[PDB]
Design a protein around this motif. Structure first.
Motif, PDB file in Angstrom:
ATOM      1  N   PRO A 124      53.509  50.755  39.935  1.00 18.38           N
ATOM      2  CA  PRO A 124      52.421  51.024  38.988  1.00 18.38           C
ATOM      3  C   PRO A 124      51.048  51.172  39.643  1.00 18.38           C
ATOM      4  O   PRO A 124      50.762  50.547  40.667  1.00 18.38           O
ATOM      5  CB  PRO A 124      52.473  49.814  38.059  1.00 18.38           C
ATOM      6  N   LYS A 125      50.213  52.021  39.052  1.00 18.53           N
ATOM      7  CA  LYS A 125      48.845  52.219  39.520  1.00 18.53           C
ATOM      8  C   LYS A 125      47.986  51.561  38.447  1.00 18.53           C
ATOM      9  O   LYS A 125      47.619  52.196  37.459  1.00 18.53           O
ATOM     10  CB  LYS A 125      48.480  53.707  39.612  1.00 18.53           C
ATOM     11  N   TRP A 126      47.685  50.283  38.626  1.00 22.63           N
ATOM     12  CA  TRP A 126      46.884  49.565  37.644  1.00 22.63           C
ATOM     13  C   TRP A 126      45.442  50.018  37.678  1.00 22.63           C
ATOM     14  O   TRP A 126      44.977  50.588  38.670  1.00 22.63           O
ATOM     15  CB  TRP A 126      46.908  48.056  37.920  1.00 22.63           C
ATOM     16  N   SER A 127      44.739  49.772  36.581  1.00 23.06           N
ATOM     17  CA  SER A 127      43.315  50.067  36.517  1.00 23.06           C
ATOM     18  C   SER A 127      42.785  49.200  37.671  1.00 23.06           C
ATOM     19  O   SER A 127      43.212  48.057  37.818  1.00 23.06           O
ATOM     20  CB  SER A 127      42.762  49.582  35.172  1.00 23.06           C
ATOM     21  N   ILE A 128      41.874  49.714  38.491  1.00 25.13           N
ATOM     22  CA  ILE A 128      41.399  48.919  39.622  1.00 25.13           C
ATOM     23  C   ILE A 128      40.730  47.592  39.256  1.00 25.13           C
ATOM     24  O   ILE A 128      40.815  46.628  40.018  1.00 25.13           O
ATOM     25  CB  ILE A 128      40.454  49.733  40.554  1.00 25.13           C
ATOM     26  N   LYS A 129      40.078  47.525  38.101  1.00 22.95           N
ATOM     27  CA  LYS A 129      39.437  46.276  37.692  1.00 22.95           C
ATOM     28  C   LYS A 129      40.509  45.240  37.385  1.00 22.95           C
ATOM     29  O   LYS A 129      40.369  44.069  37.716  1.00 22.95           O
ATOM     30  CB  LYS A 129      38.582  46.479  36.444  1.00 22.95           C
ATOM     31  N   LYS A 130      41.586  45.688  36.754  1.00 17.62           N
ATOM     32  CA  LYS A 130      42.694  44.814  36.384  1.00 17.62           C
ATOM     33  C   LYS A 130      43.516  44.392  37.605  1.00 17.62           C
ATOM     34  O   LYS A 130      43.934  43.236  37.714  1.00 17.62           O
ATOM     35  CB  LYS A 130      43.585  45.531  35.364  1.00 17.62           C
ATOM     36  N   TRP A 131      43.747  45.325  38.520  1.00 13.73           N
ATOM     37  CA  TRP A 131      44.514  45.032  39.728  1.00 13.73           C
ATOM     38  C   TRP A 131      43.964  43.791  40.444  1.00 13.73           C
ATOM     39  O   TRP A 131      44.715  42.885  40.804  1.00 13.73           O
ATOM     40  CB  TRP A 131      44.454  46.214  40.694  1.00 13.73           C
ATOM     41  N   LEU A 132      42.647  43.757  40.638  1.00 17.84           N
ATOM     42  CA  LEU A 132      41.993  42.645  41.320  1.00 17.84           C
ATOM     43  C   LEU A 132      42.354  41.247  40.829  1.00 17.84           C
ATOM     44  O   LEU A 132      42.468  40.318  41.629  1.00 17.84           O
ATOM     45  CB  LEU A 132      40.472  42.802  41.241  1.00 17.84           C
ATOM     46  N   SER A 133      42.542  41.095  39.523  1.00 17.94           N
ATOM     47  CA  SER A 133      42.834  39.784  38.960  1.00 17.94           C
ATOM     48  C   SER A 133      44.263  39.478  38.533  1.00 17.94           C
ATOM     49  O   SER A 133      44.502  38.485  37.836  1.00 17.94           O
ATOM     50  CB  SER A 133      41.894  39.518  37.787  1.00 17.94           C
ATOM     51  N   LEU A 134      45.214  40.309  38.939  1.00 14.58           N
ATOM     52  CA  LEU A 134      46.595  40.040  38.582  1.00 14.58           C
ATOM     53  C   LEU A 134      46.872  38.630  39.081  1.00 14.58           C
ATOM     54  O   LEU A 134      46.324  38.211  40.105  1.00 14.58           O
ATOM     55  CB  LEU A 134      47.536  41.036  39.255  1.00 14.58           C
ATOM     56  N   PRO A 135      47.717  37.873  38.365  1.00 15.10           N
ATOM     57  CA  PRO A 135      48.023  36.502  38.789  1.00 15.10           C
ATOM     58  C   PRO A 135      48.353  36.404  40.271  1.00 15.10           C
ATOM     59  O   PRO A 135      49.229  37.104  40.760  1.00 15.10           O
ATOM     60  CB  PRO A 135      49.207  36.124  37.905  1.00 15.10           C
ATOM     61  N   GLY A 136      47.631  35.536  40.977  1.00 20.00           N
ATOM     62  CA  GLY A 136      47.867  35.337  42.398  1.00 20.00           C
ATOM     63  C   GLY A 136      47.121  36.235  43.377  1.00 20.00           C
ATOM     64  O   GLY A 136      46.946  35.857  44.533  1.00 20.00           O
ATOM     65  N   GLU A 137      46.676  37.408  42.932  1.00 15.96           N
ATOM     66  CA  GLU A 137      45.976  38.346  43.811  1.00 15.96           C
ATOM     67  C   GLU A 137      44.569  37.906  44.218  1.00 15.96           C
ATOM     68  O   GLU A 137      43.803  37.398  43.405  1.00 15.96           O
ATOM     69  CB  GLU A 137      45.905  39.731  43.160  1.00 15.96           C
ATOM     70  N   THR A 138      44.226  38.122  45.481  1.00 11.99           N
ATOM     71  CA  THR A 138      42.921  37.714  45.985  1.00 11.99           C
ATOM     72  C   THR A 138      42.324  38.719  46.954  1.00 11.99           C
ATOM     73  O   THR A 138      41.159  38.612  47.324  1.00 11.99           O
ATOM     74  CB  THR A 138      43.016  36.361  46.740  1.00 11.99           C
ATOM     75  N   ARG A 139      43.124  39.689  47.376  1.00 11.57           N
ATOM     76  CA  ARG A 139      42.658  40.686  48.335  1.00 11.57           C
ATOM     77  C   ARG A 139      41.589  41.645  47.807  1.00 11.57           C
ATOM     78  O   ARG A 139      41.397  41.784  46.597  1.00 11.57           O
ATOM     79  CB  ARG A 139      43.851  41.499  48.851  1.00 11.57           C
ATOM     80  N   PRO A 140      40.858  42.304  48.724  1.00  7.91           N
ATOM     81  CA  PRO A 140      39.822  43.257  48.319  1.00  7.91           C
ATOM     82  C   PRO A 140      40.530  44.569  47.969  1.00  7.91           C
ATOM     83  O   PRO A 140      41.669  44.796  48.393  1.00  7.91           O
ATOM     84  CB  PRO A 140      38.958  43.377  49.571  1.00  7.91           C
ATOM     85  N   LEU A 141      39.881  45.419  47.181  1.00  7.93           N
ATOM     86  CA  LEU A 141      40.501  46.687  46.814  1.00  7.93           C
ATOM     87  C   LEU A 141      39.617  47.863  47.212  1.00  7.93           C
ATOM     88  O   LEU A 141      38.459  47.969  46.798  1.00  7.93           O
ATOM     89  CB  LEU A 141      40.806  46.724  45.308  1.00  7.93           C
ATOM     90  N   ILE A 142      40.176  48.725  48.049  1.00  3.76           N
ATOM     91  CA  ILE A 142      39.493  49.919  48.530  1.00  3.76           C
ATOM     92  C   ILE A 142      40.533  51.032  48.434  1.00  3.76           C
ATOM     93  O   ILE A 142      41.557  50.986  49.111  1.00  3.76           O
ATOM     94  CB  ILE A 142      39.051  49.761  50.003  1.00  3.76           C
ATOM     95  N   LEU A 143      40.281  52.017  47.577  1.00  2.00           N
ATOM     96  CA  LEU A 143      41.216  53.126  47.393  1.00  2.00           C
ATOM     97  C   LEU A 143      41.312  53.986  48.656  1.00  2.00           C
ATOM     98  O   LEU A 143      40.292  54.423  49.193  1.00  2.00           O
ATOM     99  CB  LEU A 143      40.774  53.990  46.198  1.00  2.00           C
ATOM    100  N   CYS A 144      42.532  54.215  49.138  1.00  5.52           N
ATOM    101  CA  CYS A 144      42.720  55.043  50.331  1.00  5.52           C
ATOM    102  C   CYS A 144      42.487  56.500  49.928  1.00  5.52           C
ATOM    103  O   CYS A 144      42.153  57.341  50.759  1.00  5.52           O
ATOM    104  CB  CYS A 144      44.134  54.861  50.929  1.00  5.52           C
ATOM    105  N   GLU A 145      42.654  56.780  48.638  1.00  4.63           N
ATOM    106  CA  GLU A 145      42.446  58.124  48.095  1.00  4.63           C
ATOM    107  C   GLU A 145      42.063  58.026  46.612  1.00  4.63           C
ATOM    108  O   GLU A 145      42.672  57.261  45.860  1.00  4.63           O
ATOM    109  CB  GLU A 145      43.723  58.963  48.247  1.00  4.63           C
ATOM    110  N   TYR A 146      41.046  58.782  46.202  1.00  2.00           N
ATOM    111  CA  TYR A 146      40.604  58.795  44.803  1.00  2.00           C
ATOM    112  C   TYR A 146      39.679  59.986  44.543  1.00  2.00           C
ATOM    113  O   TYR A 146      39.157  60.594  45.487  1.00  2.00           O
ATOM    114  CB  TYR A 146      39.882  57.493  44.437  1.00  2.00           C
TER     115      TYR A 146
END
Ligand code: NA
Ligand code: NA
Ligand code: NA
Ligand code: NA
Lengths: 211, 211
Positions: A124-146
């Motif tokens: 799945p390609k989650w909305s980037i704002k939502k991806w950041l806070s999925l349970p357990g996630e802590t990594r930074p998010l930088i799109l390799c392509e957008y």
């Protein structure tokens, strides 16, 4: 890996570089058929290790990439660890298999939208704002392509930047892409024109999708 | 803490309850003037400990609250730990001092918005979607208060629920609030009418803000 001079220029003019291994097996089915096969580990490892051995002293290179669109294979996990061990100075990222697997220090999706989810099965390609806070996630998010700039495009570009600025962990991305891959051809009158897929008799081809 | 029968009814009819200590010092300047004073720790400890001793056997109670609008003081951290120790069966929450202090297992802001940030000094109210992903944050988010239903209100309510359903860690909230605090008065004819702040000669008063 780019022509050697590219890194020198980026070192001198000042540009952050993501050095990526020459590995893409997009056409395989599934995408990781080869990358998860121990028999291809040797060929893959040279593409990663020889890249690192060549460009590890360039200050411009700030992130190592394991390649592009090759699903997620055990070979990726092995090579990810190889780099972390050999060069702990740079984060290692890889988008294959879902953009947030065990082979990437950075959530690096391609074309994930700002607010709208795209719940594709398995990857799945989650909305980037939502991806950041999925349970357990802590990594930074930088799109390799957008923001695919194909033709009359870049609509909604401001939406991304408003998000990048409001969310500390949304740290930007890399637009796709810089220059149209069109080639020059000449008509009977010797006049040049921009050509693309299929204009050289090449077939099958994907027409204008190279621009 | 409510009338003891309330909990029995919630146990039987089925409603999740947040049992909250009778501690609010909103009027102090700053708000934690008393709650950070060890001399008021004894008085505060009785309001928390005696609540837990009385209601700890009610299944309807799923969360303990250290009180309301009393800023954040060391007494809060102390009592927070006391509960975690005597009753590990229920999480402990408290909104004072920024809604995400060391005294709460749940980010529980009041009136924080869905997308809009409210960067107040010291006690900012981040957009709830953004709050979840702040660097290092991992707790769930449930608004202890939101969608202030004063008079002709609740505009934008749908926006919260769209967010609650899209983000796993956005687990809802408690609307403010259930019933208008209006009182019955009688005019010359003897007809009853709904009265609010100031209609009893009470002054100073905050008029209709009680409804
Ligand atoms: Na950012
Ligand atoms: Na393309
Ligand atoms: Na939710
Ligand atoms: Na009120």
């Amino acid at each position: 890996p780019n022509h050697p001079l590219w890194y020198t220029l980026c070192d001198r003019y000042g540009l952050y570089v993501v050095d990526e291994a020459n590995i893409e097996t997009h056409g395989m089915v599934p995408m990781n058929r080869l990358t998860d096969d121990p028999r291809w580990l040797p060929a893959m490892s040279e593409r990663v290790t020889r890249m690192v051995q060549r460009d590890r002293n360039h200050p411009s290179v700030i992130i190592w990439s394991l390649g592009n669109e090759s699903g997620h294979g055990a070979n990726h996990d092995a090579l990810y660890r190889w780099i972390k061990s050999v060069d702990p100075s740079r984060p290692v990222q890889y988008e294959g298999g879902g953009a947030d697997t065990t082979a990437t220090d950075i959530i690096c999706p391609m074309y994930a939208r700002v607010d709208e989810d795209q719940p594709f099965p398995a990857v799945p390609k989650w909305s980037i704002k939502k991806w950041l806070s999925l349970p357990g996630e802590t990594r930074p998010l930088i799109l390799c392509e957008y923001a695919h700039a194909m033709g009359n495009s870049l609509g909604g570009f401001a939406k991304y930047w408003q998000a990048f600025r409001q969310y500390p962990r949304l740290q930007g991305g890399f637009v796709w892409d810089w220059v149209d891959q069109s080639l020059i051809k000449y008509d009977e009158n010797g006049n040049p024109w921009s050509a693309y897929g299929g204009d050289f008799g090449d077939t099958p081809n994907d027409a204008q999708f190279c621009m």
